[model samples]
Target: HMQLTELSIKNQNVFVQHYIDGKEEMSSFFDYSIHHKDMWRERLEDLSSRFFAREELAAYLTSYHNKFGSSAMQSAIEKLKDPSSAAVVGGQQAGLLTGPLYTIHKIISIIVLAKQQEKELQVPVIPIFWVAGEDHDLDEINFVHTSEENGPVKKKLPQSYWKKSSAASTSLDQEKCAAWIDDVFAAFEETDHTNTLLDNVKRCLRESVTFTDFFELLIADLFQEEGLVLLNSGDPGIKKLETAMFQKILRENDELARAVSDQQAFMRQAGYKPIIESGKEQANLFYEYEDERFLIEKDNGRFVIKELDLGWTRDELHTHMEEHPERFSNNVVTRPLMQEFLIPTLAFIAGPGEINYWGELKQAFAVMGFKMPPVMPRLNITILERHIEKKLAERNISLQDAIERGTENQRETYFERQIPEEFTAVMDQAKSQIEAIHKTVRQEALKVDQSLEPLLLKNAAFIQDQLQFLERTVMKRIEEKEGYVLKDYERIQNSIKPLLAPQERIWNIMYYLNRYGPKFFTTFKNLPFSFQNQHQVVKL
Candidate 1:
C-alpha cells in the first residue's frame, strides 16, 4: 500500500518553474505547451503527416528486445507498425543498479503517460526508454551509493578501461561486478526478501556481458509486464538506420550550430542561464577512431579530430558517413534531433536540467524541418518509510522543509533545547564577570609595569580557556546521555536527504528491492501518477 502526496518543487530553476507555470516568456522558446488541454491531439495531428521507417524500426526493436528475452513487447512492437501510432520517450545513461532512483522514476513516468495518453487519444501509444549507451562518462555511471549507519556510502565498481569507448562497447568484468554488487548489498539491512533479490541480481549479471547489457536485463526484469521498448542508441543496427539522417546532419551542420547559439543568446538576453555551451565551429557529432570517440570540429571548412591530427574534407566526410555510420555518434546537441528522426515521439519526458537545455534547441529542431515535441517534466518522487514518517511527526518538522533543506536547523534547535536555560545564562554571566575582573587587573598591572602586560593577558586567557573546557565537557556528557535522540535524527536525515542531496539522486533501487522485495517497482508502476510540475512524496 502507498499514500501519494504532491509537494511544490521549490528548487527548480526560474526557467523551468516559469515554463511549468505556463509563463509566456518561457513558453516562447518551445513549439508546444504541456499545459494545453488538447496537447496530445495536436501532437498526434502533427505526427500524422510525417513519415517514419516504421517497419525497420519495429523490426530492429523486436530483435533488440529479444536479446533480453523480453516477450511482453510484441504488442508494443505491433503498435509501432501502425501508421497512426506514436511513442512517449525518455532516456538516461546506462547506470549501475539503474544508477539513482530517478532513472526508475523516469521509466515509470514514460509508461504511465503512455498508458494514459493511449486511452484518451484512442490510438496505440508505446512507451520507449532510450538508453544513451553511447555516453562515455564512465565515472558518472560506475558507482552507486548505499545506506550506512553513519550516512550514505558510495560503492564504486573497481573497474578500469583505457579508451574513451561508449558504454555499450565497454566490457564488463563479471567477477569484479558480482563482488561489487555483493559489497553494495552488504551495506543494506537484510530482510526476508534479501536472498531472492540478490539471487535475481546475480542471475542478471551472469547473463550480461557489458554494463549496458546488465542495465537492460535488470530494467526488463523489473518492468517485464509494462511492454516497455528499449532502444540502445549505440547499437550498430540502430546506427545503420540513421545513415540518411547523419548525412542530413552533416549537410546542415553549420546551420544547426548557429541556430543553437542564437537560441542560447536569446535565453541569456532574457536573464536565463543556458545549459549547453554552443559555438560557431561546432559540428555537434562524435567520430570514433582507434576505439576512442572524439568531437568533430570544423576547421577552415574541413572536419577535424584535433587530438589525432586527423582532418577530412566535406566530400570525404560525406563518403565516410555513408560507409560507416556506426563510427559517428550524436553529441548532446544532435542526439535529440537524431532521436526525433528515429522515433515517432509524441512527447519527451525531461528532468529539470534537461528541460533547461531543451529550450535552447527549439530552433535546432526547426532547422531539421519539424517542431520540437511537448517537453514534459518527469515525475519527481520521494519514498517515505513509515518510521521516517513517524519521526517527522514526532519532531514536528514539515516534510517539505526537510526535503528542500536538510534537518540541520531542527537538530540545532533540539540540541539547544537539551541544554538548560539556567545553565547557559550562568555560563555567560560567569564569563562576563571574569572578563571584567581581568580588565581591572590588567589596568593595575599596566600602571605598575608595562612589562607585566603580556603575562597578565596570558593569565586571563588561561582562565577563559579553563572555563570553556569545563563547559565543553558538560555538553559532551549531555550529548552522550541523549545520543539516542540524535541517532534518530541522523537516520531521518540519511534516509531522506542522504549526503546532503535528494534521496532520488543518491539512493539506488537495490536498497528497496533488498528490504521490500522485487515487487517494489512493480507496485509503483501500477499506481496512478499525475503529470503536474510538483514533486510526489510516496509513503510506503
Candidate 2:
C-alpha cells in the first residue's frame, strides 16, 4: 500500500523553474510550448512530413532487444515501423545497476507520456529509452551507493579501464563484477527477496560481456512487461543506419556550430546561463581510433582530431563515413539532431540539466531543417519507507522539510532541547570569568618578573583546558542519556536523505527490491503519476 503527495521542487535553478512554470519570456528558446492545448496534435502534424528509416531501425531494434532477452518489446518495435507512429524518447548513460533512481523515473515518464498521447492522438506512440553507450566516462558508471549504519557508502566495481573508450566497447570483468555485487548486497538487509534478487542480477551479469550489455539485461528484466523499446547508440548496427545523417552533419558542420554559438549568445543576452559549452570550430562529433574516442574539430577547412594530429578533408571524411560509419559518434550538440533525423519523435523526456541544454539547441535544430520536439521534465520521486515514516511521526518532523533540507536542522533543535539553557549560560559565564582572571594574573606576573610570564600563561591555559573538558564531559553525558533519540534522527536522515543529497540521487533500487520483493518495480509502474506534480513523495 502507498500514498502519494505532491510537493514543489525547490532545488531547480531560476531558468529551469521559469521554463517549468511556462513563463512567456522563455518561449523564444523553444518551438512547441508544453502548455499549448493542441500540443500533441500540432506535434503529430509536424511529424507527418518527415521521413525516417523505419524498417531498418525496426529490424535493428528487434535484433538488439532480442539479444538482451527482451521479446516483450517486439510490438513496440513493430509500431516503430509504421509511418504514422511517433516515439516518446529519453536517454541516460549506462550506469551501474541503472545508476540512480532517476533513470528509472525517466523511463516511467517516457512510458506514461507515450500512453497518454497515443490515446489522445489516435496513433501508435511508442516509448523508447536511448542507452547512451557512446559515453566514455568510465568513472561515472562504475559504482552504485548502498546504505550503511553511519551513512551511504559508494560500492564501486573494482575493475578499471585506462583508455577513453565508449562504455559499450569496454569489456566487463565478470569475476570482478560478481564479487562487487556480493559486496553491495552485503550492505543491504537480508529479506525474503534477497536471494532471488541476487540471483537475477548475477544471471544478468553472466549473460553480459560489456557494461552496456549488463545494463541492458538488467533493464530488460525489470521492465519486461512494459513493452519499452531500447536503442543502444553505441551499437554498430545503429551507427550504420546513421551513415547518411553523419555525412549531412559533416557537410553542415560550420552552420551547426555557428547556430549553437549564436543561440547561446542570445540565451545569455536574455539573462540565462547557457548549459552547453560551444566553440567556433567544434565539429560536435567523435572519431574512434585505436580503441579511443577523440573529439573531431574543424581547423583550416579540414576535420581534425587535434590530440592525434589526424586530419581529413571534407571529401576524404565523407568517403571514410561511407566506408566505416561506426567509427563516428555524436556529441551533445549533434546527438539530439541525429535523434531527430533518425526517429519520428513526438516528445522528448528530459531531466533538469537536459532541459536547460536543449534550450540552447533551438537554432541548431533549425539548421538541420527540423523543429525541436516538446521537452518534458521527468518525474521527481522519493520513496518514503514505513520505518522512516514511523520515525518522522514519532519525532514530529515535516516530511517536506526532510526531503528538501534533510533532518540536520531538526537534529540540532532536538539536541538543543535536551540541554537546558541555564547549563550553557553557566558554561559561558565560567569560561569568561576564567579568561578575565587569567588576564589579570598574567598582567600581575609580568610586572613581578618578565621570566615568570611564560609559567603564568601556561597555568592559565591549564585551568581553561580543564574547564572546557568539563563542559564537553557534561555534553557527552547528555548525548548518552538521549542516545536512542539521536539514533532515531540518524536512521531517519540516512533513509530519507542519504549522503546529504536527495534519496533519488544517491540510492539504488536494489534496496527496495530486496525488501519488497521482485515485484516492487511492477507495482511502482502500475501506480498513477502526474507530470504537473513537481515532486511526488511516495509512502510505502
Candidate 3:
C-alpha cells in the first residue's frame, strides 16, 4: 500500500551493529581503565537513567559468594578486596538468557575467556555470575518454549496477560496462575512430557518462590556450573562494603582521588562533555568527610546538603553495610563497583544495552580511584532448525530477506502485477465509468456543489492509502504466521529458555534442588551450562 517514504542516512545497521558487533579488535582492546571507552559503571548509570530504571524492579543479583566460594567467586572477592586487578565476568540473571540464548553464550564465552586468561596470563581469573533477581517485572521474566514428542512447539504462555487485561492493570491471583499453568499444560494434548513438566514447574514456582528462591533462581542457573560464582549482595557479609568506595576507608585508600582525575581527563580527551547535566534541579555529586554529608552541583557551582535520616554515622554505616544485604539495589554500575570494592575484577560479561548505558559512567569509576572493568558484550545469536531451514528454503527466502521485505507477496504482487485479472478489468471499466460520472458530477458540482470537490478528493486519497495499507498488513501476517517466522519464534525460545525452566536443565534445578537437599549448592556444581533447552508441547 505504501512506497518507500524516505531514504535513511542514519546507517541504522551500524547502530544495530554497535550492540551486536564483535569484530576488528582495537589494539588497546583489553584496557579497562575507569576512563576506558567501555566502563561498566558508565553502562549502568546510563541504563538506570535512560533505560527502564525502576528502582524496586532492579533485577536482583544472585548470591553465589556464600554458597560456592569455590574457585571463581573466591578469586573475585579476593581480587576486588586487594585493589589488585582480576577479571570478573558479568552475566545476566540466571545465565543463558531466556534459557540457552545469549546468556549461555556469554557464560560460556567468559568461562573460556577465564580459562584462556589463566592459561596465558597465569593470573587466576574469576567468573562471577551476577544473578539479576531484583527484576520484579513478572512480564519480563515469564514465558519460554519447549517441545514434547518430536519437535512440535509448546509455549509457556503467561496467564498474567489475561488477568492484566481483564483487571485493566497488574493483578495477581494464585488461582489464576495455577489455572493458567493447568490450561497451558492441558493444551499440549500432543504429548505428556510437556504437561508433566509444566505442571511441576508451575507448582514449584508457586510454592518455592515464596522464599528468596524466586530471587535465587537467577543465580542458581550459573551455580550449576563448577567455575561460576554468585554475588548474593543480599547476604550480610557482602553488604559490608555498601557504603564506601573502599570496604574500609580507614585503610586510607587515597588512590580514589587520582582515579577521579583520570576519569575527567579521559572524558575531555574523548571530546564528550564529561560533566553530566542532571535532569533534576538538584545535582548531588560529592559527599564531604568532615560532617559525613553529601554535596550537590548546580549551575556553575556546588552546595553542601543535608536530608533527614539519610546520613549514616561512621560506625552505623559500617555496621548496617556489613549486616544488611537486602538494603540496597546495585544497578549495573554499582554492581561492578561493589565487586571492585570487595573483589579484584578483571572482565565483565555485559548485555548489549548494558554496554550501551556504560558510555556515561566513566566519571563514577574515575571518582572511585579504582580501575574500570572490561566490558564484553554477552554473546548473541539466532538458532535455526532443519525444519525451519526447510521452510525458508522451500519459500526461497532468507532471514534477512524476511526482515528487509517486511511483508510477503508485496514484491510479487506489485512487480508481477498479480492483482486478479478480473479485478483489474473491473477496476479499469469502473475507472472509465467513474471518469464519465466524475466529469458529469464535477460539471454539475461546479455550479451546485463546489464544496464537494475537496471532500471527494480527500476521500479518494484516504481510500487509496487504506487499501494499500490493508493489503500490506495482510501480507505481513501471511509472511510471518504462515511462513517460518513462527519457526523462528520457536527456535528462539528453544535456544533461550533452558535456564528459565531449570529442571528441564540437566536435572531440573528448581525441583531437584528444592526437593533432595534444601541446601543443594554442592550438588549444583555437577551441572554445566548447556544449550539443552528444547520445545515442550502443551495445550492452551
Candidate 4:
C-alpha cells in the first residue's frame, strides 16, 4: 500500500457531491449500494449469467491485444471464459496520444478495484478498458496541453487529420503525425529518458494504421504490466457479437425512450441535472451512413434517419443489422447497456462526467432487461511539483489556502493581519469622533431649520466614503511593500492551477510524466485511491 495525502476540495460540483455525501441521491441512479462491498458480491453471479455464454467475446480480445500483452493479460482474457469471473471496467475515447490525465485515472481505478475486490470476495475479477472507438466527435480528442517557457501550450491536430471518419476508421497521415509528435515533446524539458520515451511513442504511431491503433498501443504499453484487457468498440468481431443486442434495442426503441424519459424526470425532480439529452421518441442507437454516425428513430414503427433522408421497415432494419452489425452503434443511452451485456461487470469505474451521465440511464438499463451496475467514481488527483511545494513552504501557505483565497485576496488579507495596533485604534477613534460631530451638526442644524437636517446627513455620508478611501489607499501601499508574497502566491497558483483550472483537467498526463520521467506512472499505480477522500495532492 502507498501513503495517501489529501488536497481538500471545498467547492465540489453536483456529481462530486454525490460521491462524498449524496448517498440518498446516488441510490436512486445505481442498482447496488456503494456503501456496502458485500452487495457487489451478492450480485456478481446473476451478472455473470447474463453475458457469460458469449465465448466469442474472449476471441475478439485476441485481435486487440496481439501486438502488446503480457502473460497476465492473456490469462485475464482466458479467465473471461470462467462462469465465476466478472470484470471491473472503464472506458474513454480514442484520444490523440491518450486524451487527458483522467483517462489514465479511470483505468487505474478499474485495475485497483479489480485487485481489491478479487482478494476480498475470493472471486476472479478482471480489469477491462473499453475504448470508445465509435465516437465521431473529432474535436474532443484532437488536442492536448503541454508546458513551455511562457505557460501552458495547446497543440491541436489539424482538421484535415480527420475529415468525416469516426476515430477508429480515421486513417492517420504519418508525416503530419510525426510533426505533431515533435511539437508535443518540444514542450517537455529534455532528460535522459526523453529519447526512449519519444521513440516508444513514435514507434507505436508508425506501426499504427489508424488513430485508434496508436491510442490502444500507447495505453496498452503503459498498463500492460497491470494486466489490463483492452476492448475496442470498433472491432468488427465485437460489433458482430453486439448485433443481437442491437436488434433487441431496435425492436424496442419506443419502450427504451419512455423508460429513459421517466427516469430522467425523476432525476430532475430530485434536484439533479441530466447529463445527456434524449427525447422520448428518439432511438437509443445510431446508424452509420458512410463515415457519419446518424441517429435513427421510429415514426409509428417505420424507422428513419431524418437528417440523412433514409428510412426502412422494422424487418428491413433487422435484416441490415444481421448483414452488417458494424453499421449500428450504441448512443450514450445504449452504450452502457451494450457494455454490461458483453461483460459480467462487478462495477464500472467512472469519471465525474461519466458519473453524471450514468445517472440518467438506470431506467434505460431496465428497459433492456438488465439492472444498472454499481457505478464507482474514479480517483481525483493534483500533482504538486517541487517548485510549487517550495513556494508554498516559503510563504507558509497550505494548498487549501492558496486555492480558497486567490492571490489578490491573500495580498489584502496578509496586510490587514500585519496592521499596527495603533493604526486600528486611530481609525476607531476617528470613526467615533465623526459620529459625535455628525450628530451635533444634525441637531444644531435641525434646530435652526428642518431642511438643513437632510444636508447634514448627506455631508456625513461623504465623510464616511472619504475615510474608506483613505483606508484602502494605505492597504494598497502595504501590498506594494511586501510584493514578494504576491509573487510567491501567483507562482504557486500557476503551477497547481494552470489557466485557473484544476491541474489534471488542464495539463496532459505526458506533461507530468515528462517532468518526472517514466517512473511517474509506476508511482501513480502504487498509490491508493479513494473517491470518498475527494482530490489528492501528490508531491512529485
Candidate 5:
C-alpha cells in the first residue's frame, strides 16, 4: 500500500535527499516522546510507581498529566477545561497548521491514535498539545499552505511586545485580528464553511487564549471540547509552580547548566545536532520562571544561562526551595514530575523526533528522580487514493516510482507519458510464434538444435517486452517516461502534504483571537474543535 508522508521530522522532507521505499523518514522523530499517552504516560507511570509505588498520587498524576496542569496547580480553576479540542505545537515555520493538508493530518493522526488506545485499553485518552506559546518569533508562524496559490504568502502581524523592536503598535483587538485573518483566508475559495470555520475559529479563541497562548490553543484544537485543557503560566497558581521551580532552578542553575552542557557535548560527539539551533553549542531551550529568566547551558561564554532572581527574590527562592519545597519544580528535566506530582495523568504521546530528543533527557529524567514514559510514535500519513492508484497503473508505474517524485500528480503524469506504448501481452503472442516455429523446425528437420535454446529464451524476453515499448523497446520507454512522473506527481504527493510543516505551524492563540475578537470565548463555546475539511487541487 502507498501512503503520504508527514512534513516535519522526516529527514528528507520536501525536495531534499532521496531514499529507498519504506525507509524511515526523519518526520517520525519526536512524534513519540511528546504525544499523549506515549512516552509521557509510560514514563510517568513508571516514574510514579518507582517514586511512590502504586500510590493514588502517582495514578492521579499519570492519568491526568497534560489534561489539567495550570488549574490543578494554579487558580485558573474555573477555566480548567480548555475550549478547543486539539492544539498544535511545532517550530512555527510552515503552514502545516493549515498548510498543504498535513496540519489536519498531524492532528487527526494523534486523535485516532488516542481513540485506538482508548478503545483497546479503555483509557480516556485525550490530546493536550503544548505549543511553545512563549515563542516570540513572529515571522515563524505567519503563513498557511494551500493549493489555490503557488508560492507561500507571508503576512506580517508584528507585535511590538512579541517582536523585539519598536514598531507601529498594532493593538490586538477582535476586529483587527479578524480583518487580517479574513483577508488571508479570502485568498482561498470562499465557501459557506470556509467563512464559518474562519469566523468560528476567531470566536472560539477571543479571550480564553491570548498572544502568548500558542501552546494552549493547540491543546484546545486537538480534541476540541473533549480534549479541552489549557495552562496560563501567567496565572498566580501557575506562577506558584514557576516560583516553586524557580527556587530549585535558581539554586542548581550552574549544575543544571553543566548537565545540559555535558549532554550537549555528548550529542556532538555522537554526531547528533539539534534542529532548533545552528550547532550543539547553540542547542539550549530557554524558559520563563516567575522571577527569573534563564537559558539552559552546555557552559558557554557566547551564551550565558542568566537567572535574574527578580520574579521571586533571593530570600523567596530559598524559602520556597526548603520550606514549601513541593511548590518548586525542575525544568524540562523535572517538569513532568512537577506536573504529575499533582495532576492525574495516564499516558503521554510524542512526535517521533521527540523520542530522539529524549535520549538527551534520559539522564535528566533519572537525575530528577523520575522515570521516563514509554515512548510511542505519533500518527503520520500519506494517503494515496484509488484515482491516483489507477493513474499510476495506467502509466505502468509502481508505488516506488510514484513516491520518487516529490509530489504524486507529477509522478502520475510521468508514468502516463513514459510507459510503454505497446502491450507486452501482445508482444508475447508475436514471440510465441517464433518459438513454435523453432519447435516445428527442430522436430521436422533438426533434432540437434542445442543452440536454439538460447535463441528461444532471448527471443521470448525480447518479444515479451515489446508490448510496452515506445515503438520497439519496452524497458527503454519506461526509462524515457521516468521524468514525467516527477512532473505531475505533485497532484497526489501534495494532496496529502500537511498544510504547514510541523515547526512552521504556530499554535499561537492570536491566530484565533484575531478571528473571534471579544466574543471569542462565547464563540468558542461550541467546543471540542473542528476544522475546514480537506481541500485539494487537481490539475486534471
Candidate 6:
C-alpha cells in the first residue's frame, strides 16, 4: 500500500471535520463510537437481529447480480447466505464516468471499512455500492469535468434534462453522448491506453440504453476484481425486496415527517446548518406513473400526487403500494430508513453533504423504528502528478502553502514582488516631482486668473492617468519576463485545486485513468485511507 500525508485542507471542509472530531451532542445522533472493535463487539447481537431474512436477501441479490456481475461478485453474493454477514454500504447518483473522483473514494471507503470490521467483529462483511439511479434530476448526472490544456473543462450533454423520468428510465442519445465523450477525451494527454479506454467507454455507451446502465457497466469494469456487489434501487427485483419497507414508510409517514422537522430544529440549535428541510404535509414517498415520478402528498384525508391529477385515500394508496411496489421510490427523508430496513448496513460511507443531511435524520430513524448506521467520511485526496510535483519543487512551495492561501493571489504577489524596488523608487520620485510642479503652477495661475484653476486641475488629472498607464505597462513587461517562473502554478492549481476547490470535487476519474493508465486506479486500491484524517495529498 502507498502512503499519504495529511495536508492543511481541513480549512476547506469544517462540516466534515466537526462530525469526525465527535463533539459533545454529535454522539446523540450518530454511531461513530461503535466503529471501534470494542464498540462493534457489543452490538453484534442487535445487528444480527435487525438483519433477518438472510435467505430471501441472498436470493434477490443473486438474481440482481446475474443480470450484470463478475465471478468475484458471484462469490460475494453467495456469502450473503450466512446470517452473520453484514454490509458496508454507500450510494451515489449514476453519473457518467462514475461522476466525481469522490465516488471512487466512497466505494474504496466502503470496501476498506468492511474489511476492517470483518476482522474486528468476526462477521462476514460485504461491500455494497447502491446506485441511486432512481433520482430524477438528470442534470446532476449529465456533466463531467476533465483537465484540458487550458484547465478544467465542464462537459454537459445538451439534452432535455427536466423530464419527470428518473435517470434509470431516461434514454440516452448515443451519438450525442459519443460526441460529448470525444470532447472530454480531447482534453486529456494521449497515452498508450488512450485508444482502449476511449473504445471501452464508447462500447459501454453503445450497449447501455440509459445513464444508469452505462454507470453500472463502468463500475463492473473497474471494480470487478474487488468483489463489490452492485445494487440499483430502481431495479424491480430490488424494489420488490423493499415492498414491506415502503408500506412501513407510508403508514408512519406523518410521524416520520415530524421527526425530520424536529431534527432540523435540533441541528440549528446545535450551531449547525440543516441539510434538507423536512416537509410537514408532503409524503416522503414518490409515485411513478407513465415513466415519470411525482412526490405524493397528504391533503385533507386523501393522498395526492403533487404535480399530476391523481388522488387516493389512505386505503387506496396502501392498496396501490402493496400491489405494485415497483411504482414507488423513497425520497430523501425516507431513503436512508429504507436502506437500513432493506439491508443490514453496519456502516455507510458518505461525503460531507450526506453526513450533514444524515445529522438531520437520527430522530427520523428513531421514529421510523430503524437505527441509523455509522457514518464514515469518504477519502479526501489530491492527486499530485509528476508535472505538478516538479512545479511545486521549482517554486520551493510546499503543498501546505499552495493549499492554505488563494492561488490567484499567490501569483499576483509573485509578480508584484518581481518589480524592482529601484524601479518603483524612480516612479515614486517622478510622481512626487510632477505633483509638486503641478501645485506650483496651479498656485501661480490661480493668482493670475481663478478661471485657469480648472484647466490646471484637468491637465494634472491627465498627467496622473498617463503616469498610471506607464506604470501598468512597466509591470506587464516585468511579468512577461519573469512570469515563466510562476506560470505553471496554473498547472499546479488544476491538478491540486481546480477552480479554487479540491481536485477530487473537480476532476473526473476516467480522465486520470486515461491519462496515466489503469495503474492510477490500482494505486488507489493500494493507498492507505482513513476517515480520521482530514485530507491526503497523494504525490504520484
Estimate, for each residue in 397-513, the C-alpha lDDT of model 1 and write its tens digit: 899988987787888889889999999999999999999999998998899899998899899999999999999999998889888887777778888888778888889798888
Candidate 3 segments exceeding 4 Å error? 1-30, 33-87, 93-101, 122-124, 133-192, 199-212, 218-223, 241-329, 400-429, 432-436, 442-540
Instruction: Estimate, for each residue in 270-331, the C-alpha lDDT of model 4 and write its tens digit.
Output: 88878688886577778887677787877878888898888989899999999999898887
Cα lDDT tens digits for candidate 3, 180-260: 456544533434244444554564446432223433444443443444655544333334334554334312223332333
Model 4 per-residue lDDT at 234: 72
- Cα RMSD for candidates in order: 1.6, 1.6, 12.3, 5.5, 14.4, 2.5
By how many angstroms RMSD does model 4 differ from the true structure? 5.5
In candidate 5, position 112 carries an lDDT of 49
What lDDT score is found at residue 396 in candidate 6? 66
lDDT values for all models: 0.88, 0.88, 0.41, 0.79, 0.40, 0.81
Model 2: how far is 237 from its true place, Å?
A: 0.9
TM-score of 5: 0.53
lDDT by residue (1-540, candidate 2, tens digit) is: 777778887655777888888989877788889987698898998999888889999988888777755566898899987899999999999998889989889899999999998998889999999999988988889999877666887788998777899999999899999999999988878998899899999999999888899998888888867899888898877999999999999898889998999999998998888979769788999999998899999998899988999899999999999999999999999999988998899999998888889989999999888899999888989999999999998988988888877888898799889999999998999989989978987897798789997798788889999998998899899899999998888888888888678888888788888888856667788778988947988888
> Going through the candidates in order, what is the number of backbone clashes in each?
0, 0, 54, 0, 141, 0
Better by lDDT, candidate 5 or 3: 3
lDDT of 5 at 333: 42
TM-score of each: 0.96, 0.97, 0.54, 0.84, 0.53, 0.93
